Symmetry: D2
Subunit: 444 residues, 4 copies
Amino acid sequence: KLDKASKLIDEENKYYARSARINYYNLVIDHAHGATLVDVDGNKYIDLLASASAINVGHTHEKVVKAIADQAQKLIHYTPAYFHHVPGMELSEKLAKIAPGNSPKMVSFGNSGSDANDAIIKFARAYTGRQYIVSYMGSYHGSTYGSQTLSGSSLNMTRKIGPMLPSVVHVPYPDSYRTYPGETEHDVSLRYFNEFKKPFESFLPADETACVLIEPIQGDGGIIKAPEEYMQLVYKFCHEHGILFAIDEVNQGLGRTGKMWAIQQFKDIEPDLMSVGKSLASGMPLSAVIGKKEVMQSLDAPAHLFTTAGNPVCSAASLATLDVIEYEGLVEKSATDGAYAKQRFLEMQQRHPMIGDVRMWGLNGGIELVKDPKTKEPDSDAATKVIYYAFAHGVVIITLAGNILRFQPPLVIPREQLDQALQVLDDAFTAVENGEVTIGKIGW
Amino acid sequence: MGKLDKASKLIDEENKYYARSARINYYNLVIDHAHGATLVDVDGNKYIDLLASASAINVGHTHEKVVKAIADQAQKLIHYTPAYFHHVPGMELSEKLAKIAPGNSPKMVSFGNSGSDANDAIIKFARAYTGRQYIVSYMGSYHGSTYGSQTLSGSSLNMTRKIGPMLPSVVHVPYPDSYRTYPGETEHDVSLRYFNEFKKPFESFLPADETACVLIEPIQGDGGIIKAPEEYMQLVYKFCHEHGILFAIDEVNQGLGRTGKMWAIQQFKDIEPDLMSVGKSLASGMPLSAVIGKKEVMQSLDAPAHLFTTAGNPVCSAASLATLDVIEYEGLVEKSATDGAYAKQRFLEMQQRHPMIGDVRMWGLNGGIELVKDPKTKEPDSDAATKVIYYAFAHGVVIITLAGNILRFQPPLVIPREQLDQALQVLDDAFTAVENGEVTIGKIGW
Amino acid sequence: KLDKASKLIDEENKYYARSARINYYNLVIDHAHGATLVDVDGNKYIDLLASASAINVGHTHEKVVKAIADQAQKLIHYTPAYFHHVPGMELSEKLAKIAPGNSPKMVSFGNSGSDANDAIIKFARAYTGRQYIVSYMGSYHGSTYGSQTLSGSSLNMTRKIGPMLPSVVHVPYPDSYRTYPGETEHDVSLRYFNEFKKPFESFLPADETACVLIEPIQGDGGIIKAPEEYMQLVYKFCHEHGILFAIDEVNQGLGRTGKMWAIQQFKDIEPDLMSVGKSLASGMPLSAVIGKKEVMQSLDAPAHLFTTAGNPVCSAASLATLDVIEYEGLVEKSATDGAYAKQRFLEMQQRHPMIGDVRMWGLNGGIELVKDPKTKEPDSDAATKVIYYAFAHGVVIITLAGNILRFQPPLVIPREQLDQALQVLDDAFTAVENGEVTIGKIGW
Amino acid sequence: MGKLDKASKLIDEENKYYARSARINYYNLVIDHAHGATLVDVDGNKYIDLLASASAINVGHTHEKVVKAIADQAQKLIHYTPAYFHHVPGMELSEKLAKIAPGNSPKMVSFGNSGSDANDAIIKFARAYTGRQYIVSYMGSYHGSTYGSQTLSGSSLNMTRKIGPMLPSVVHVPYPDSYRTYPGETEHDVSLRYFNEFKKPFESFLPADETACVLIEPIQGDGGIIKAPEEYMQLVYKFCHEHGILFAIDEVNQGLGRTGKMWAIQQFKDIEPDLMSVGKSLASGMPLSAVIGKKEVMQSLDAPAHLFTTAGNPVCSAASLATLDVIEYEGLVEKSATDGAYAKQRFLEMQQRHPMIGDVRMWGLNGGIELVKDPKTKEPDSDAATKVIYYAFAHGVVIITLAGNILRFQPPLVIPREQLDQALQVLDDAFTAVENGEVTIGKIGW
Ligand SMILES: CC[C@H](C)[C@@H](NCc1c(COP(=O)(O)O)cnc(C)c1O)C(=O)O
Ligand SMILES: CC[C@H](C)[C@@H](NCc1c(COP(=O)(O)O)cnc(C)c1O)C(=O)O
Ligand SMILES: CC[C@H](C)[C@@H](NCc1c(COP(=O)(O)O)cnc(C)c1O)C(=O)O
Ligand SMILES: CC[C@H](C)[C@@H](NCc1c(COP(=O)(O)O)cnc(C)c1O)C(=O)O
């Protein structure tokens, strides 16, 4: 069934470095539309990954395809780093405006979420005149040297490549699942905030910290959301010490959580700096750092620019992509379908006790599998068999951190397919319970 | 004059929203559409392109094979990240790049989006393969704007100011200047002198045996189209291999036929890099890059040490396959060599008549025409180069400057001889015009 | 009483940088002996600080004075960095032998605890081929760029001097007083070991960590001892991952804790690397890093040396200093006088509820002062009052961390004097409770 | 032969316990006692000290006033830390040092234990005062063995190997070499060439406006007794003062009369430092050091940014007070100046008869005699230098080498003319004896 796919992968493994791919299964995609992937052997699948939340508006949206094709006929590329073009001008202004909050904003383009997160460091340091950056354990911010240092989701992002960027301090992110007996959401918030302050009470001067960077919901961490009160404490801590408050919206923005921006899951928080990428241009490489105007004015050329950033085709694909999110009401749909999928997985959890935790905000969720509900011991083996059963039954899903099923379908996903995919996962759970699935390095 | 009104207005609006640090400004050129070496602005004016979007447009604007590849690919799959799964344009391209890279040792590839991220990877791969931390790169260099690649760079102080500390364990060395030499020095003197400067850190505080790699532009772009002497490069290459130091090259600006060979390092005798970076022209300006390295080196890391969600995007992969096909079947490597020897002669003739031209440097349709206040002092004359680019722009030619006083000559490799001759004549005219004070002219350039 | 002191201090202030002294009171010491200090105004005091535990054998001990005098007549200095002298030869050998545990050891001399801690970093990195160093929040390791990066007890050891040494990670030290309601010592041990592991489970590879450096009892932190269990877990974690286990015995060695080395308060822990200073030469500038032999052979000259380290006068003084420790049995005497002083402090806590915590291990202690025994809000104002009283009644004592009284008198302090000092401290509490004490920057 | 038995046994026992990286080895000299310029070993052999414990014994070994200050202070108080409290000998010295420092601008002082830690303080104070991060130091320099000062250094690869990453944001520049020059170069050509190298990092990746200080040895010690030319120093001093860069000097080795002025920076016209490190001879080899800077620089930090338990030890402080009085009362500064000019002639005369002497450098009783295999190639001759110090040791003279091939001449400043001439005759004989192959030889030296 995967004869061609397997032959092409075996060839690719001779020429394409293994560090450039987290492998799960032999899926070679030929074409796709909406939430449907078709492989080179003719197998069809429903996509519950959306190329890691880059395909929020669905694969090959008619509108995005046309913008791409039309723009490519006029100009494939002229660098905004030297000169200008219209899609770029129009996009940079539109992004300045749809970013959360009311303060005047400016924008700088990149190619990837990585480089936008490097930008956040640059802009925070330059505006504050301070050097230290605080970021979170469990985070993923990119694979360039700045954003990679801020990250804490894989040891292979640190092994053999150091020394890393200096003056970076990692603090732990609130885990509302593996908690101490009898802890409320209040306790968790306060205990993690207390851990947050320890470096500041010892070796890290708050008056020399340029900024704090946070995923309002951690993606690669395992779809973990900060509690409301935790986040308001951090936010407040930052404004009281003149530390910029920065958000990474690259994974969780553009409607993934059922609001436009995942920071809007929290009350009245306007970031000083934010990174955007992934779904921005429907998987075409474009990113943006968007900060308050006075922060963005603290650097002079050429501190931060890329030859191919704000590519006019990418830009056109992005304008059409933002229009699909508005015109098809994808933010609201994500909230709705997400509430629905939440209820469906909680019901499955009544019948499959390998499901320890159901986290979901919009059509973005982490379904954490454990060996026993009270030890909460991770059971990656179970998760791997679930995704293997899924793949063999027309559903593409992967894991985070070994034992968490990752749920991030295109937001356009028809209800019919959503229900088919959910039924396969229910079936998978039963199969794995029954010993009916068996199995190099898989996943994180 | 009264011909740039729409452009001026759109720019004044853009500047309210788009950070000033994101653009090196020259003139009010807003491109509407383009083809070949011809740009058409939003005001309907037409220009001959002598920049090729900073060497990203080697096959010319909107090549119909590249357009075609983009549109057809987009119809099937806009994206699926090769960081998790696979697609055919990316598989075919990675393989092809491993084979067409310089030399015969087997290679592997890792994709990025930018020349910046590929140079970050060179750091990664070198350190992991060698187990050593120090990186040596050059004064005058440009490697990118991510923290690794930006630290390696040495072409603008605005790439260091207010954003440090930068990446540790990097050392800069001077790049050979063959124009501003000491009186009497030969090419051999220059080579030896700059090799002696290369060795000074290694003879004091920098252990050769803890140095992972030396990264070098075979010809420096942002530095001002400066080529290392043959013998210099041989000594550095030799030194690297006597010490277990990887020899790495940046072919982002000067690869893919720009110098009149496929790769800039092929201007030198029998140098095979361990690691190289590619970008820019790779996919005709679509965002795609690669680090190409020897197979053992590229095997030194495990995932996810280096990957990006949108790197090796299939639309960009398809555009790149089409771009590399065009380069071969249109013979762009050879055309760049032939037209370049021709451009060099035309500029040397111009230098006989216009004493402000201190140095003509050209390898392929890749040149730096360095302007100076006096042939003997060689004092840079930025003001004159700024004047020449303003004159050129006003007569339908788009050209910019490097390091203040150097005219950057990098037109698409497809440039028709008709247009190349029109553009060279306009520059000839510009020199005369500037001599006679006809041209007038906040921060322009580097 | 302090006419001459103040005129002298006033002049010094014009010429000696204020960063170079943590200020408490106008004490200008003219001479001393044992535990008795006499100022230039002829006032007399009892020494409860021992020059930050640098004078364990008491001031101007007759045998150390003689060593100094006699050596200075033969050779004031010849640098062992180029050549050799006998007092240095003899001391290095003796130090290699009296270090804890029985693995063969070698030694390098420095001038300060600070530089011995820089050496720990060098030797750990060199022996392991790894770069990362873990140290603790609340730690104090020194004032040279390496040791100072590792430290975690004053924001003024980081402010304005960065960037600091890279590849250093700080972890939380187990606080056995401000705990969560219900916690045993077992819970504390495991909670703080769980914090220890978090960086190694996110961004810090255990296999690239060269060493963990720990004060067995933290001094500048407030005389905080690590629980036995937490320490066995860290100790084990390092052996399992090839991380070197290193201890700082600069403040807490040489009998301060009632055993020879503070690490001997724990069961069967032989360190890979250790720093020594302070009391080693009676406050004469001398330090050593002592490591397992194979660790110390990982470097070639001149990786770690100083012109004036292992100065022969300093080495003579140290040899004599060590002999007094043995022949006056100060190790035993510290343990006895400390169990005694502990009960005297527990007694005072009965009558003075402002005493929230009594921590004592040998004649080494911290007496923590609070505003309430349940809130445990620190009362810095109280502790400043207590020490200002003590001073005005012939007792030299200082505060750690604002609110913690520091009890570290020379180990040879006579029982008569100890009781004299303790009674002044008793009077001090009552006087402060009755508002009978009134009082820029003081202490930490 | 048969004279070194006790020494050999002792060193052989020492090597089992004392780490090999703590000593640069030359020969089996184990000192029992010394006085003035006379060392006596444990075997009862006698020698003339031409090293002064690396310029730490300027006033001679066991000077009676220094020995007396040590004894007398020890009976009153061996230590009370100035980091917490005060004592009279530290107070007096802190003030004398602020006053005897070069230039008229008011100064403050902070005490350390070692020249290393004083250079670490230079880094901190410079960063703190300017609010800038970058430090510029020299290739060939030695500043110390603590992470800050060690990162500044550039005289041995074993100061960087296996212990990095080092301190970030440090840049090394080359120190002017007036011996191995290009044909025809005057001292003006050297000064300008080395300044042009100084400027290259500031013209590429290092913003002058983000550079906190330059740290320079006025005469390099471990680099081989190399003195910057006057004009090179003026250009650096100038450049610093035009950009808000602190100008900092290390006087640890070359201070306190060694050069035949009180401070080596006084060999230059009208240069006052912002910061200087002092150590070594300060307290006659007892562990004491100071950072001395302009008042306002020293006020840029709050406690405890820079302090040490045993810094400003009262015993070391009294030794230092006595040491400085001896320097003044015995006219040691002028004596180094006079005996220096005399020693220079002598060596210059030896050069005529022994052509292996390639270069004679001398400023005070402070010289490097550089041995080469040929006058025109200037190829280092380590072998010859090592043979000379072995001849020398055998005939009652203790001298060592710098950089392989450079004889280090740094006797106590109080050395009597008869001993000086005794030791100079031995060296004259050494040369001739090595020319005849009469001398035989782990790693020796640097
Ligand atoms: C290829 C997918 C990546 C391994 C990872 N996402 C990348 C990411 C990034 C980096 O984005 P790129 O540089 O575009 O990959 C930045 N911020 C967050 C919150 C991210 O999740 C993920 O979603 O698994
Ligand atoms: C926008 C253009 C850029 C400022 C500059 N070239 C970028 C470049 C880069 C960086 O490539 P990107 O990250 O794709 O901009 C890497 N290596 C070399 C040799 C380069 O020249 C240039 O050609 O001027
Ligand atoms: C001046 C005294 C110091 C501020 C401080 N102790 C210095 C110290 C040091 C540094 O020793 P020095 O470099 O000799 O000051 C190293 N390790 C520990 C555990 C230390 O406590 C103290 O005990 O308060
Ligand atoms: C032990 C002798 C040392 C290897 C070396 N000098 C130490 C030194 C130092 C360091 O002094 P300490 O840290 O006291 O050794 C600082 N600055 C200069 C210019 C120095 O020369 C020397 O003079 O050979």
